[PDB]
Amino acid sequence: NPINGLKTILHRVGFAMRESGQALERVGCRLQGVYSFEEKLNRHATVLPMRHNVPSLDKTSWVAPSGMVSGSVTLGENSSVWYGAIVRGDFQPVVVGSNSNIQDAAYVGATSEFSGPVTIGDNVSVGHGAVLKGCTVGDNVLIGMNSIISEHAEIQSGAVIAAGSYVEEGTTVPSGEVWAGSPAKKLRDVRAGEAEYLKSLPGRYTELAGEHKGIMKVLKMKQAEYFA
């Protein structure tokens, strides 16, 4: 891809100009006698591009400040990445649908050498502390807390993965079924009263993401009062 070749040349030239400028600014600081540049503050980035691969975030999506997205990440409409969650697409890309939630300190990524891209559908609940490596998740699926979904596994639409389960590599989970266990296996079908709570789950997270985004805006304005 020669387009990527031109982008590579431009990114490397701009990076060299940035290094030269920051170094000259540090020389200026040393001449002034001010050593604020030496502070070992937290250099965490909520959005982390990988050369010319920038995450594509919708204007109604939200990523928490302790969360992060890296590389080729697509977040759809009203989709949320919560506190401490890590979504990594610097090796292979990540695609997240609309109204889907990646809950607190969850890992979604495609970083193994033979992993395909991660594809998460619409209205998907990814629970606390779940690890997702190179999988495909269909629409209206709850990923339970502290669960592992392996490479090339297919979580079809309407299925429930229980908490603490481990779905093996290349495992197809059918529609409308509940699977549990560390050698994860079919337990039962999804019941109707269960499916009502499954339908009502992602909208709550949408409104919770709205409230938390507003509070983070308040925090940013409080921070901006100090230096501006």
Partner: protein
């Protein structure tokens, strides 16, 4: 002296900067101002070496002719020349 000594000095400066990065654990393109300073120093160092080439040839022919070794005029141009070979 040699015609392409400055270009050789610039390649030497680039390799110098790359090695100074590799020793300190950085990628090859990091700190390009170090590469630029190394290129300037390498260019002027190898141009000075190429000047010493002509100077050494001139000293040899001058000393040899003062001692009594008479060199024919077809061969004196091999020495008393700022040849840009």
């Amino acid at each position: 002296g040699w015609a392409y000594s400055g270009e050789w000095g610039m390649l030497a400066g680039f390799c110098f900067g790359t090695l100074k990065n590799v020793q300190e654990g950085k990628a090859w393109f990091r700190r390009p101002y170090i590469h630029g300073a190394g290129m300037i120093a390498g260019y002027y160092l190898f141009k000075a070496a190429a000047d010493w080439e002509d100077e050494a040839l001139k000293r040899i022919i001058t000393r040899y002719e003062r001692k009594g070794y008479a060199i024919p005029e077809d061969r004196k141009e091999l020495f008393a020349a700022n040849q840009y070979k």
